[PDB]
Every structure is written in C-alpha cells, then in structure tokens.
Amino acid sequence: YEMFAQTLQQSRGFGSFRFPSGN
Amino acid sequence: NRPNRLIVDEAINEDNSVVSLSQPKMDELQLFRGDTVLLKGKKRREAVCIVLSDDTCSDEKIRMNRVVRNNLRVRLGDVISIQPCPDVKYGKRIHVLPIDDTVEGITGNLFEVYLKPYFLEAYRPIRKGDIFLVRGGMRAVEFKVVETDPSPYCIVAPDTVIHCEGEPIKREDEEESLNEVGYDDIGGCRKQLAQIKEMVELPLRHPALFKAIGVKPPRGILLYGPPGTGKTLIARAVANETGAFFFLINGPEIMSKLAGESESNLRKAFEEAEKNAPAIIFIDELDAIAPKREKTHGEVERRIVSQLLTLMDGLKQRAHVIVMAATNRPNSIDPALRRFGRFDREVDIGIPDATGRLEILQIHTKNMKLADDVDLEQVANETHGHVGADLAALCSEAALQAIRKKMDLIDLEDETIDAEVMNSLAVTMDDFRWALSQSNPSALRETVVEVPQVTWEDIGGLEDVKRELQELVQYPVEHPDKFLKFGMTPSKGVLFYGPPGCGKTLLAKAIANECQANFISIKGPELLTMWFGESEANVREIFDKARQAAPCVLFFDELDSIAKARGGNIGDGGGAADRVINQILTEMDGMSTKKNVFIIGATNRPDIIDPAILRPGRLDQLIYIPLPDEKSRVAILKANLRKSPVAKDVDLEFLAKMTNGFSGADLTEICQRACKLAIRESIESEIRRERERQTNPSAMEVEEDDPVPEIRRDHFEEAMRFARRSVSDNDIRKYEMFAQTLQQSRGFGSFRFPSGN
Amino acid sequence: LDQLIYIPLPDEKSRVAILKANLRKSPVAKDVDLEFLAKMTNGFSGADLTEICQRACKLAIRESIESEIRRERERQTNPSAMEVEEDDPVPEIRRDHFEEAMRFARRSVSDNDIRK
Amino acid sequence: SIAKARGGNIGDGGGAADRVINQILTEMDGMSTKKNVFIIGATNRPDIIDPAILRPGR
Amino acid sequence: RPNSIDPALRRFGRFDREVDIGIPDATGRLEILQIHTKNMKLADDVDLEQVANETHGHVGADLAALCSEAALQAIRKKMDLIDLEDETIDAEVMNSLAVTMDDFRWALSQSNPSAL
Amino acid sequence: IGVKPPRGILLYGPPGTGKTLIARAVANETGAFFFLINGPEIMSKLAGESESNLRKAFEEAEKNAPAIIFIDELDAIAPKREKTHGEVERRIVSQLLTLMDGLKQRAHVIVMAATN
Ligand SMILES: Nc1ncnc2c1ncn2[C@@H]1O[C@H](COP(=O)(O)OP(=O)(O)OP(O)(O)=S)[C@@H](O)[C@H]1O
Ligand SMILES: Nc1ncnc2c1ncn2[C@@H]1O[C@H](COP(=O)(O)OP(=O)(O)OP(O)(O)=S)[C@@H](O)[C@H]1O
Ligand SMILES: Nc1ncnc2c1ncn2[C@@H]1O[C@H](COP(=O)(O)OP(=O)(O)O)[C@@H](O)[C@H]1O
Ligand SMILES: [Mg+2]
Ligand SMILES: [Mg+2]
C-alpha cells in the first residue's frame, strides 16, 4: 500500500515554483 | 642555556650570506634584522652574515645556507656562538681566485659575467677565508676569498674595487666541494627524508650517547620504489650529511665476479666497514643478489644469499654500523631478509606529485639560463606520471632543442669557445611544449596516491550529506577522546547509491580534501580484470598500500560491476557470490580500526549488490544522492565554467530554472557544446579575415589585430536545443522504492519515557 | 551433527538483558527506563537493539561536539575571563536521545520468515 | 564481433561482458590526451554493443 | 612452518616431538610489555593493560619495536633535552625522562603487525 | 654545454631491415672509432674468454674516444631471466650491466645495439 501510495506521488522539483518579481 | 649558542638547521632561502632566526629568540637576544652578525665555528674560522626574522624558524636553532655550513667545518646538530658587530665597515680591495676543477671547461672573463651582478645591490658581507658559489650560464663555479686589505669582517660596497688577477689555484685538501650531494638537491619526498633522518641521525651523530641510552637501534632499512626515484641520491645525501664512512656495494659488480671472489668482496666490505665505525653500507639492487628461492637455480647464488644472511645476523655486535638497501619492488626479495634483526624497517619512496615535480624542475633548472616566457608551474601541472629522471631528461631535451634551433649559434661557435654565447642563450616556452610531445613516461600504470584538490565549493548543496560525511570521517581523527569516554566503536564504511552522473566521486574527493588525507581510487575495469584473470590476490596488495599511506580514503567505484557482468543477478544460477568481493570482505574483517583507513563504495544498481557487504562491521551506512536541486544546478554551472571566458551578459540563474531534472553530466555536456560552438566561430572567422581579405596587403599589417569572440548568449541559446535528459522517470522511481525499503520506522515516532511523581 | 536446536527471537527479559549488556561501556543516565523500552520492542532481534543503542550514542556525540565548538570558539575570541568559566562537559546519554533515535528503528525479520 | 559470437546478447546468460573490450576500455582510460591518437569504431549492430563504451571520456 | 620440512625428518628416532609456540594473547602481551618496560622509566599517565588490550595480532617482536618507537618519540619530542645534551653525557637526563600515554597512542598508528 | 648526452640507443625491427647498415653508415659519416661486437662470436667462446673480450672491447673503445660501439643481436647475449639457465650466461649479463653503468665517466662513448 505504501508503494501504491508513492506511485501517485505529488511532484518532483515543482516545490520551489515562484512567480518572478521585477520592477 | 645561554641564547648565543645555536644549533645548525637547514635554511629555505638560497642566498649565500643570509642566515635566519626566530622572533622570540631574537627579542631575548636583543637584535634586529638590519644587523650584520658574525659567527664563530671550529678551527678559528668565521663567517659574517646578515640575519633576518622568520616565523617558520625554530627557537633554539639557526637556519643557514650550505655554503655558510661548509665554510665553518660545522655540520648539522653542532654549536655555533654568535657575536654582534656594529664595527663592520667598508672594504678597500677584494681579491678572489677561481678554482681549477670548476673552470676546466669555461673560458674567458668571469668578472663582469659572474662577479659584477653577484655583489650588485645585495651588500654582501664577505671575509678572508670563505668560499662562495655562483650559479648561472649552465654552470656553477666557486670562488675563494684569498686576500683582502681591511679587517676580515667587511661589507662589500659598490665603491670597493674587486681584483680578479691571478691563476686558478687548487683548494686546501680539507675543503669540500660540489662533488658530494646535500639535502637541497632532493625534492618531493620531505616526509620520507624526515623519517630517514629520525632513524639514522640520532644513532650515528651521537654514538656514545646512544650507547649510554642502551635502547637498541634499527640496523636494516629497506628503501623501495619505482625505478628512477633517486634512492641512491638520498642514501648518498644522508651519508654526506652525517659524514660517516660511506661504502658502496653494487649488486651486478658482485655477481659479475667468480665463485669465491663474491664472498671475499662481501667479507672484506663488512670488515673494512666495521673498522671505520660509525659507517653506512649501501647495497644497491638487492634483488640481483638475493631473489626468491624458486628463481635462484644453482648452488653458488644460494650460497651467496646464505653468506649475506650470515653476515647480517653476525652484524649484531653493537658496532654502530647501519646497512641500507634499495630495490624496485618489495616482493622479489627472499623473505628471510624480512625477519627481525635484519631488513625490517621499510620506507616507501613513491612517485612525486605536482608540488614535488615543481621542486624537481626548480632543482634541474638552476644553472641553465631561462627566458621569461616559461612558467614552470604549468609544466609541473601538465607532466602526469613523471618520475624525476623523466623530468631531468625533459630539461635535457628542451635545452638540446634550444641549442639545435639556433643553428646561427652553431655558426657562432664552430670550434671556438665563448662563455658569452652560453650566456646569450635561453629556453623558450615552445621548447618545453615540444618536449612534452616526445616524452615517454614510465609511471602511467602506477596507482596514484595523493591528496585531492576538489573542495566543497565545486559541489552544490548536499548539506546534510556533507554534515553526515564529516561526522563519520573527521570526528574520530580529531577527537578520539570522546570515543574513549562514551565508549563506542567508530564505523568503518559508507555505501553511496543513486542515479548516474551526480557527484559521488566528487564527494569522496571533497571529504578527502576536507580531512587532508590520501585518496586511492579503484575503478570498475580493475575489478573486472581481477575477475576475468582470476588474480584476486592483488586485493591484499591494495590494502597494504592503503595501510602504508594512513590516514587514507579508499574508494571502490562501481562495486556492482562483477554482479552486473555475471548475469545481472539472473544468469549462471548463482546468487551474490564472487571471488573478488569475497577477498574484499576478508580484508575488511582483517584490518585494525586504529589505522584510520576509511572505505567508500558507490553503485548505480543497489538491488543486485551482495547483501553480505551491508552487515555491521562493514559498509553499513547507506546514503542516497538524488538529482541536484536548483541552487545545486547553479553551483554546477558555475564550477564547470571557471576555466572559460564567459561574457557577463549570460544569466545562469535563468539557465538553472529551465533544466528541471538534469544531472551534472548533462550540464557539463551543454557547457562543452557551447564551448565547441565558440571555437568553431573563432576559427572560421580568423581564417576568412586573414586569408580571404587580401593576399597582397593594402596596409602593412592586419588592421584589426583583435580576436573577436568570447562565449556569449547565442552560443548557449543554440547549444540548448541539443540537450537531453539522461535519466528517465521509471529509473528515479526505482531509486525511490529502494530508498523506501530502508525506511526509518512505523509508529515509533511518538515514543516517550513515562513521567510519574 | 545430529542435535538440532532452534533459537527464536528474544523474549522480554532477554531484551532487557541485551539492552543492559550493550550499554555497559556507555555512560547512561539513571533516568532511563529500560524495562519500558523492552515492552515496546515486540519482535526485534539483538542486532536491532544494538543498532538503536549505537544510534542514540551517535546523537549524543553530535550534541557534545556541536556544543563544545560553539562554547569554545563562538563565545569570545579575546577572552573576558582568564580561562573558560564553565570547564564542564555537558552531555551524557539521556532520555531525549533514545526518544529521538526510536523513530529510526525497524524490524529486520518479517512474519513469513518466522513462519518458515 | 565478440558480442555477436557469444550469444548475440542472448546466449550464455551474461550481458555486455568481455575480456577484450575490458582491456580496450582500460587502455583508453590509461592514455594521455597530448599524444593525438584518435580512436574510431564501427558496427553493424549498435544495439548489442557494450553500453560502457559510450560513456564520456571514451 | 611444519610443512616445508623434508618428511624423512618426521620419523621415529628423529624429530618426532612437536611443540607449537603460537601467538600470545592479551595476558601474554601484557607480560611482554612488562618485560620490555623494566629498565625504561615510565610516567604514570600510561596504562599498559589498555595497550595490551588494543594491540591485536602482535607478536612479541612487534611489541619490542613498539616500545622502541615510543621511547624514540619521547626522546625526539624533547628537543630541549637534545639541547640539554649536545655532546655531554648525564645520567640524570635519562633519569629525568619518562614516556607519556600519547607516545604509545602515536606508536599504535605507525605499527604494522604481522599476524592478522 | 654540460647537458648530459644519451649513451644507449636501441634499434629494433623485423629481420632484414638493415640496422647494421644504418649503424655502419652513421659510423662512417661521423668518422669516429667504430668497433663491432657480434653476439654469437662472444657466446661461442669459453667461460672467461667472453668477459675478457667484453672488457678489452670497452677498454680499447675508451682509449680512442670519441667512439661508437655496436652490439649486434643483443638477445643472444642478454635474454629474459627465465631463459638464461646456467650460471655463466647470467654472469655475462651481469658483466654487461656492470660495464654499461661504469661507462658514465664523460668519455664520449656511444653504445648502439640492435635486436629483432
Ligand atoms: N626526486 C628527485 N630529486 C632529485 N633528483 C632526482 C629525483 N628523482 C630523480 N632524480 C634524478 O634522476 C636520476 C635518478 O638516479 P638514481 O638515483 O639512480 O634513481 P634510482 O631510483 O636509483 O634509479 P635506479 O632504481 O637505481 S635504476 C638522477 O640523475 C637524479 O639526480
Ligand atoms: N632499407 C634498406 N636500405 C638498403 N639496403 C637494405 C635495406 N633493407 C635491407 N637492405 C639490404 O638487405 C641486407 C640486410 O642486411 P642487414 O643489415 O643485416 O639487415 P638486418 O636488419 O641487420 O638483418 P639482421 O636482423 O641483422 S639478420 C643488406 O644486404 C642490405 O644492403
Ligand atoms: N555538486 C556538483 N557540482 C558540480 N558538478 C557536479 C556535482 N555533482 C556532479 N557533478 C558533475 O558530475 C560529474 C562527475 O560524475 P560522478 O558523480 O563522478 O558520476 P558517478 O557517480 O557515476 O561516478 C562531474 O563532471 C561534475 O561536473
Ligand atoms: Mg640504484
Ligand atoms: Mg645484425
């Protein structure tokens, strides 16, 4: 059940998404 | 214990009249670095010198040059009184004479060529009775100060005239020369020379004191290394430093004789060495005399081996005799010579590293005049796998190319000899760049044992991994007392695992740099070579090299190679069985924990590894190394491009945002591809601008004279569309699954001790 | 070899004695309850108990070193007093170290293996 | 040739292991880059080749 | 080793009685250290029993060389005692010198045993 | 000049490529005292006569400096160690190794040798 729970895992590398803030 | 008494120590500075002292001894003696001091030694002979200050100089000892050392009849470890003299004034005339055996080949005037820049601007204090040395012009020549009109302590002023009229005279018979070799002529083996000094000096320098000590000395020292490392040179230098009766024994000279003549030569050698105690006996090429028992066919050679074994055991008479011997490998020796009371102390003279190679080049380029184009440091960085004899031959080849290319200088001296022609010749950088192409080294097959140069700055992120590695490695080295207090056994090994191309080798080299330890790398092809050839007895020979260079980090790269090559845990029916991994486990269980040898493995397929490696007392830590994050990608892109000229218009932080899911090797690939695009643009611009413009030029030269490109935005912008991901998604899911099969716990997170009353 | 002797997983008193025998070298505070510690660990082996003891010891060593470095270097470079005013090693192995090292412990032997 | 002759990446159970290709990889990793010796291979069956040859530095 | 001998020397009326002198254990190593440290003066920091417990796979000649190396490290580190006797001989200087525990802790790192 | 020369040059190739011819041509061009040494002529002699021929050859070449010594078929004199059964041939190999190392006297003597 832990393996099947990890086969539907959230994401990889999208945790640090931020919109750019300029000017 | 009055402070004017000083013990002779070797000086780092190569100036011929400058001594050095420490700061608190000089402050206690109340002197200053501007003072010109006077020294007194044996046989009423003196030396006037300029003293300075130093922090690396020891307190009770004085550092001086070998020129000052041989001009006092004083060796190391002796005593010299010092007297300050503010009465040192200028001279009247200076009359020196050359010495015949150093001017046998040189000719012409030596005054303006050598003596005029020698006394220029240095304000050298000289004395009647001293002998100094001048290098330059592919020759070193010495001059004895014969006659001076004023007081013997005097400073050479530029007003003082120097007289050089007279025949080249011979020396006094008690005087030394450059025929013998000192400690300065040897580079790159400071630790081994220190060990030989510790073993050899204290018994031989003080025979009666050490005899009153009563503790037995060592009496057999076995030097070994690759061919050409200069073992004969080190033995002769230590023999010339201690000044004992040195006698040389050469193996083929004995084995070229008849039957009884070899034994007569050995017995006469040891008798004449025991007469002149203290003495040093050096036996060169020991394996030519005493090889293994299976190889000495015949009776007479086994008889000679037994004669040597008899005389080494009969040497134990407390006769102050030390026997050194050199060989090319410790395995070919008859093992009866390894016993106690015989050749038991072993010194490993390895191949030199880059600092050592730089010191060898500085030693061999003393006399030769040298153009300012060259950079010896870059030469020492480019020579890889070069023993010191290769470096001497390289300097020889560069000098011969420089003399060859000046065929007009061959015309300048057809048969006449001028010192000024050799003074007029220097060596360019392209001579060394040519000599690196016709250099055939002899040490590419050798295992490299050195400290790495990769720091933590080359690696991006991995902070908890950095913390756990320094906790596992650095703490038992620095603080053993805590492990004695709390009473645990420090762990022995670490297995890294993860996707390919993510910096496992860099982490091993980084922690080896952090702890300042040696590093031994063993790749997958060597393990596969041992598996195909069934030569798994070389593993013990690896671990012996690991013990001889302690503290050390032993890195087994691609530990799953034989298991992947066998069937991939599928073919041949067997499971997790191997000759080589078995021998590695035996050697891991064998070794002691006091030696501080730390073992690191690294795999890409952690499922097919042998589970018997992961037991306690072995590689028991498992560390997962994922694909790099965004700040790590920034640091990787910075670390790859330090050598290249990158325009400041390039945004790397935008470049790390697009590349979600790359490894390190992909980023190095795209950087090198942009570099290839830049090189192509530069070459195809230069060819057109030079050749296609005009054949017969309008202007006198090229009007531009400007290299156009650097690496800029459009190169990365073009090289991006060739980049690809090396690691797919299912592969990453496999490593995540194996990481979860070693999960921490379930339900033990809320454990608390009961708190009652 | 004709005698066959089966050696099972250790019982509760055996787990108490294993936890006592592993920790004779280490300075353990007297506030620690080992008899409560053997009740939770139903189904561990000996190697799991040695693992969790050595992990608590690692946590204690890390706390001692990262306290000593800060207290010596970070306090003052040029000292106010003549020497260190504390001159006292702070840690021993205590409750929070076992309490933290418990959540990394795992069972090595599954149920089907025991059934075999 | 040896990979085709062995099993065609099918027989003998093993995968991409060879004495001779191992020695070629060792000699490729050994040599210096200053000598200007350039190595060229050629196959007709690129699927059954050893993947350890296709790494960088090779 | 008993295997390299010509087996005709094993017969009766010849070399038939065999005595096996094995490597010594920890009590034996302690007795060897006590034998070799008779004449040498000795500071009270050291504990020879812990030294005998830590030396594993050491023949008695290794222990004699270890005592030699610790004594030479102790004479080496006192370079002020090298200054105290440049060429004169005093019995009191050798009377004034003892060997610390860290000399033995250093000599265990440069010890290459022969019986692992 | 003072830079050391090379003093041993080893020509090698397949049989019949004309190595003897190249050596004789360079010897006739430079005009130095050329002396020829042939391997089977040495190995056809008795025990002491081979060493006497080698020593007389190098003495008479060192008298007429500058000189070139050519040793044809070097493998007939000095093969591998496993192949030189007997004592006298190993003795001749050691004689050659002695004389090549004793040649370093700055005596303007160059030694060439050919093999297959
Ligand atoms: N580290 C070094 N320092 C100074 N000179 C060196 C060094 N290594 C090599 N050389 C020089 O290279 C030559 C090596 O001479 P040797 O002392 O005979 O070396 P070697 O290790 O004894 O070679 P073998 O084993 O006797 S054939 C000499 O001309 C040395 O001056
Ligand atoms: N490249 C060449 N130029 C001129 N003559 C050659 C050449 N190659 C062979 N020869 C002739 O072929 C013969 C070869 O004689 P050698 O000099 O003895 O050759 P070799 O290589 O010394 O054979 P070995 O090894 O001594 S049996 C002579 O007659 C040469 O003149
Ligand atoms: N933290 C990092 N910083 C910079 N480069 C890295 C980093 N990690 C990996 N690399 C890149 O990876 C390459 C080394 O790969 P490596 O980790 O040795 O592969 P493997 O783990 O298969 O041995 C280097 O060329 C380097 O540029
Ligand atoms: Mg030698
Ligand atoms: Mg011929």
Residue numbers in the entry:
A (entry chain F): 755 to 777
B (entry chain L): 21 to 777
C (entry chain G): 639 to 754
D (entry chain K): 581 to 638
E (entry chain G): 349 to 464
F (entry chain K): 233 to 348
Paper lines:
Both D1 and D2 domains can hydrolyze ATP, but only the ATPase activity of D2 domains is critical for substrate unfolding.
Using the same dataset, we determined five structures of p97 in total: three SH conformations (I, II, and III), and two DH conformations (I and II). The p97 DH consists of two identical single hexamers engaged in a tail-to-tail manner, with the two D2 rings directly contacting each other. In our structures of p97 DH, a longer segment of the CTE (till residue G776) has clearly visible density and can be modeled with high confidence. In both DH conformers, the D1 ring is in an ATPase-activated conformation, and the ATP-binding mode is essentially identical to that of SH conformer I. The D2 ring in p97 DH also has a substantially wider pore than that in the SH, likely stemming from differences in inter-subunit interactions in the SH and DH.
